Symmetry: D2
């Protein structure tokens, strides 16, 4: 099943879409500068691109780390990003009451992994009618994603993306099960599956590349980066993706 995001086609047999940006929104000027770099590199390669940032990040590593400019200023920044570049945007929501006003502006709304079974948030997100990115918890097996999908369907929204971020592997360590992509496709109606390589990890750039290439080899809708260098990386991913997506799914 493909999902249209403005003029982008997102789907497991379409050219991959890059989801990338910055961790937390701080100012209009800085956001535009980073966004402009993603836009320039992706336009030069012909890769569809969706800008990501948090306006209120609720899971930072310290309680006084800056959580972002907050809802009202964050949405004003996202509006400017959209007007200036003509691209879609994505952000995470963690409070049910924020879903509607965020959805007025942000094309894709993201369900944080830890909150993925929180029924009130699921329902509030679903009711926006927007495209939703469902982050797979590291403690949930790929055959359980279908339960989350079901809850969205019950709440009236089938525009769902499933986003892999690794699985717990002993203590303090994540492994990405490359077989889980196919499990999610088969059990969840071939919804678009994208791969958050950045959170899947924890030199490092060489790791991100191997891991990204390995995941994209399985035929995926997109690559998600919590992130010369970007360009070189994307050249390699696009080479692999172009090859994979050009061959028909096996008989």
């Amino acid at each position: 099943m493909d999902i249209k995001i403005n003029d982008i086609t997102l789907g497991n047999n379409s050219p991959f879409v890059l989801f990338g940006g910055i961790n937390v929104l701080e100012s209009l000027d800085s956001t535009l500068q980073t966004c402009a770099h993603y836009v320039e590199v992706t336009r030069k390669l012909g890769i569809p691109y969706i800008f990501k940032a948090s306006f209120d990040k609720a899971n930072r590593s310290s309680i006084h780390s800056y959580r972002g400019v907050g809802l009202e200023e964050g949405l004003k920044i996202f509006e400017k990003v959209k007007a200036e570049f003509g691209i879609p945007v994505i952000t995470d929501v963690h409070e049910p009451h924020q879903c509607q006003p965020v959805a007025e502006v942000c094309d894709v709304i993201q369900l944080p992994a830890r909150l993925a079974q929180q029924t009130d948030l699921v329902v509030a997100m679903a009711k926006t009618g927007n495209v939703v990115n469902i982050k797979k918890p590291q403690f949930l097996s790929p055959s359980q994603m279908k339960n989350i999908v079901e809850k969205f369907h019950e709440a009236g929204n089938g525009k769902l993306i499933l986003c892999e971020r690794g699985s717990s592997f002993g203590y303090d360590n994540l492994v990405v099960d490359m077989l889980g992509f196919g499990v999610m496709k088969q059990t969840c109606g071939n919804l678009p599956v994208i791969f958050d390589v950045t959170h899947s990890l924890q030199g490092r750039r060489a790791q991100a590349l191997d891991l990204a290439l390995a995941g994209m080899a399985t035929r995926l809708a997109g690559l998600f980066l919590e992130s010369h260098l970007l360009e070189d990386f994307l050249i390699r991913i696009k080479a692999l993706d172009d090859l994979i997506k050009s061959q028909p799914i096996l008989t």
Copy 2:
């Protein structure tokens, strides 16, 4: 470090405390009945007791599943429990705005395992000043609990209980690492460590719960956390006679 919960002393070298009750509050009458049974059994066995229930099941499989009585009615039921039995109570909170009104009634407030890294909730819970039970996420290692403790400390609340509930082991399965209890004691300032045997089984019986509970309590713990309806309620007394026997033995031996 011990924690006083009204007249109860909770600590890793004190007699174990039972945190026991039910999954979710369904009605006043059923709650009082179950609670009365826990109280009667624990008083006669001389086991200190805190009543547990959720007022909301927030992460059920269906949008149409029963969720429990909800905050307003739930707090009314907790108020009646406290007035009728004179015992402390514990319940979980899922949203920052719930913390202060819940804490006005419930002695211990609990941080759900999945939400344990949500900073907004941590801060809102810390600011209540109440005793907090931190459910250890299945996906976090015992050495990383200190990071959560640090956040609460930075927010000004040091009255924290660490609650084991098992670790992810491959897909859809949990294992309890009996070494993790000591790791938590050593790295988190010997705060009280309790064991939720009920949720540790998770994805596996009365025989199993008893073996697992005894194993964990053998490592010298401040308490045991459990649900009945989950253990059959009528087996509670026999179960607790066993856990107390072991706990009395273990706590009577000097540490080292």
Copy 3:
């Protein structure tokens, strides 16, 4: 099901048996000194005791580190242990040809975890008619132990002990699943289950850990505890204090009927 090992009764509802000794036989005099210490402490506490050592260490830290004294001299040292102290002994075998000569001297023969699905070794061990200790591989689940048991039964030997030694938990780390003991008892006919606490740690002071882990396991009602000490692995001089604690817990548990 109980197993008689000379005058010892090994079983899940019997007083726990200590299987203790050393990693590898390296000498005579030092073996006897270590054994004597175990003997003295266990006799003083009334704990049944079986001396353990390998004569040939299969997985060595380096290719030239000493493998141990080998079969022939190893068996001679086991003979001396048995003659001097009157106790049973346990050792591991690695090749089918070793099974007969080791079984003639040793009261229990041990199937190494890494070799536990090697059919030729299983058959050769089973055919000795000796008591066998089966080490549970870290990569095998507890419900699969029944398949090894089956193969022994097909080959004519039901005198089997199951030994826990942890499960792989992510990379280079072991967890002991305390529920696996009961799984092994339920699926394998209530054969004796013992716990190798020494190899369960492995990848993790260590003394405080060994005690916590041993106490936790023994709380589930087990036939025995399997450990290694070093003569200066638990410090040998702390053995009495360690055993006092294990005995206290075991005596309590075993004194209550199963629920």
Copy 4:
């Protein structure tokens, strides 16, 4: 570091080599038939090929289950394969005393994963001087492979292949950590790394996804088992491998 196996160049920046065959040798005729098929598919696609089989099934479900032809007859069959097709062959050895006679016939000798820390078997394999395929235990981290490599080096043999076969993931399950390939290359001197997709695991769809993902990390070779499913798989793997190997290392 590349390894020459007759006229095949095996290495992490060379075109991938297929190691394929059957589980256990049952008879000459079946073996030649299966081998002929692999040879015919690989030749037509231009993929270097090494025939694999075990002469013994060391873990049988029953004490009475079929065992395979055994060492003596097995080696005779490997000799015929080599004479008829002119290709290298690979087999596993489980006991030290087997190493020298097997190594007389088989080009590559394989160290089984559960036996990879058995020091007597390591030394006896090293001493053959043959190319050795070291199966990574499911219970070992990729950073520990350097310790096994060290032992082989100390015993005088540096012709070593490292082979991924998955890691224990809870009970009765395996996962393949795609980051382990790079860890093994960086810590073990860029020895050839290959991927046993068969033992890492409809199910044919799984093998293809997994094989593609692993080969995307740039590897020396693959293990695979067999309406023309083998050829359809290999067409895809070769396309990907050619692409990956054509990009400069970053």
